[PDB]
Symmetry: D3
Subunit: 159 residues, 6 copies
């Protein structure tokens, strides 16, 4: 029935992302975890890496489908027959950008409804960017990542 899309760069997927997509799967029949292919900011992991890490970290969720996309998110959501756009809501500065993005997406595809989900307090203060920056400077980010992601990030930063 209800098809939802949860897009992002997921570079890499964090426990914050797992919390959001898990909540989405309890609400909607099918959830597409949609990984943006060619972000303008050179992602740390390749698209194939981000997709494979996210598949592994969500494999326990029956109704998640991990797919990469390079179109405008709204164009891809339209072609996937999604009517729900999942966005994670952490802090107020996130909120301001999300409101601009949501109004633009509504202009581009009014039949796509943006829904904002709220993560656990546990993940309410992290981001892929902060995690990467901490790990790059020899900080412990084990608590923030799925184990498979933690292993790949160590491997990535070792070289």
């Amino acid at each position: 029935q209800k098809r939802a899309i949860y897009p992002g760069t997921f570079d890499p997927i964090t426990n914050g992302h797992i919390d959001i997509v898990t909540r989405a799967t309890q609400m909607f029949d099918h959830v597409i975890l949609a990984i943006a292919a060619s972000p303008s900011k050179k992602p740390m992991f390749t698209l194939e890496e981000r997709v494979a890490l996210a598949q592994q970290a969500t494999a326990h969720l029956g109704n998640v489908e991990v797919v990469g996309f390079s179109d405008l998110m709204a164009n891809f959501a339209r072609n996937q027959h999604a009517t729900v756009l999942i966005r994670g809501l952490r802090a107020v500065a996130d909120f301001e950008y999300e409101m601009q993005l949501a109004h633009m997406n509504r202009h581009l595809m009014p039949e796509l409804e943006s829904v904002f989900l709220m993560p656990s307090k546990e993940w309410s203060f992290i981001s892929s960017s902060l995690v990467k920056e901490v790990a790059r400077h020899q900080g412990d980010v084990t608590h923030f990542l799925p184990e498979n992601v933690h292993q790949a990030l160590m491997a990535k930063l070792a070289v």
Copy 2:
């Protein structure tokens, strides 16, 4: 059958609220528009008045059920077999309070998932309180309220 609850004081229900509940009905099979008694807010309209205004203003939506309540939110949602709690997200200062509410409601009922919807730009700068204050100075608030609500607010202040 996905059951969602949209709680609030709705004193009175505005077009902003109609926007949110309409989006909700497009997403979920059954939506309970749930009117909190909220005596501490000293509402302008009684709970029975607010319930009847919202019933009339949502009557065109097949899958809306308007109910009044004075229970703890989490208990009322459990008792209505809802697993989704809808809140409208206007501006940053609302957002902060909503996070406290949602984290409190999650603590009390972890299977009740809060979802925030965003209203049209048309209603992004109004509130029940602002409309009431405009009407208190006899300003034209027809654009912001359902007809039946507009009349009742007029009659109330006359």
Copy 3:
């Protein structure tokens, strides 16, 4: 001849308000400092008291006219032939409310253009309410108020 109106509760007028209206008079030919009755805020000073305090505190500014009003803002501005509505912008939480006000006032009078001015850093962290609360505990608020206002606040709390 450009006419601007600077409305507010001004209970009491502070140096922050003096800063804003002074900037306004440097920009526009005639500035109406317009004191809202605001009975719902239960002001400390009566409208007549607030009007006289502001008259005295702005008397050095040639092109300020102090007036009290209880009308709808948009009507009073239309009736004063103003096309500019001045508001002071302090912090983010004020900003959110001001946008709702300005969008409401624009809806009711689209030719009334809201302009926001920014006060000196010196007054960017005070408000009428904060000063009153300090004075209620006999703290020194001479730095934040015009002399005549300081005296009246003293006399009031004595």
Copy 4:
């Protein structure tokens, strides 16, 4: 010997407050937990009740002294020979008010330095007011309050 004061209404003291004062005692030699009378907030508990609840809830901390006061903050801090004023920082809307408070307190006592501490994520979304409102609807607030405070809030609402 560094003396710090942690003022607030503490109506009632929550685990969020316990978190802050505990962090304070790890940083400063002596911490005065100072309970403002705040009659304008119409507190649920009397000053004497709030003082006794906080005394009991902080009794395990050797270097906490609980005191009630109705003075101007700056005077009470001067009179207690404190040079540090502790405030907890939750969210953006608190932050704005705290800056106004700290700049006012600095004006009145420039040697009183405000320091903001950040509570655990566990308490980052609660407040005395939110807990009271939950308890008013008989929701379970045991997780948010010290045992003695939880009992007193129960007894009060019974």
Copy 5:
């Protein structure tokens, strides 16, 4: 009499900018629409392009003058005998930066008064950046731009 300056990068000018400058022209006798020449972020359109697009899109407003500048804004405003600085106010995150900018401009030129105008709800959630990003990824931004700007942006992205 009263000379006002409305500076920005206008890369490209949007309907949000037209709304602001139009409101400014109803308030002040002469409005200089001032286009910053060499922003550090390589603008999509050249200065000559931005100026010509803005001239065309404001030609109906009698008391607008479109000019490019490369000095510090305050230095240019001083040399132009402007005493009013028009800033558009969209959302709270804009506001924080605008307050820092306005206090700096006041330090640099105290006789230049910053005034913040508020755009229509219609344009309260867009920016040149978001519009460009949407258009670059094959989204429809026709509603946000003057027709002449829409034509030039399509031409720009076709190559």
Copy 6:
């Protein structure tokens, strides 16, 4: 007794930084002013320059020690036996990032307590970035910098 660290990039140190570190020295027995060595954003002044400018501008404060560091801040604070982390709090957008940073630092080193100090109203609206940008475009930033820093910045921008 109590050792506090005040880290940053200090590129260059401003009067806002002097205000904060001065308040810190009145509160804590020893204050390490810790200058991050290799920020990802190519700092205007070298690490040796930033350290020498900061030493000169704080030389009047007896209990300040200026040191450079290249580790993760928390790792350096741990190795320096600091238990207080001084952060300066200017505006709400600062606050949101500071909360994420403080929670991360608490995860990485729970015995390091973050404390937020508030600067004078005089410096509540400036940053190293805005000062640099103004100076680079021929604006007067004399009021915002220690004299030694003002001299070095002019020298830097002359070439």
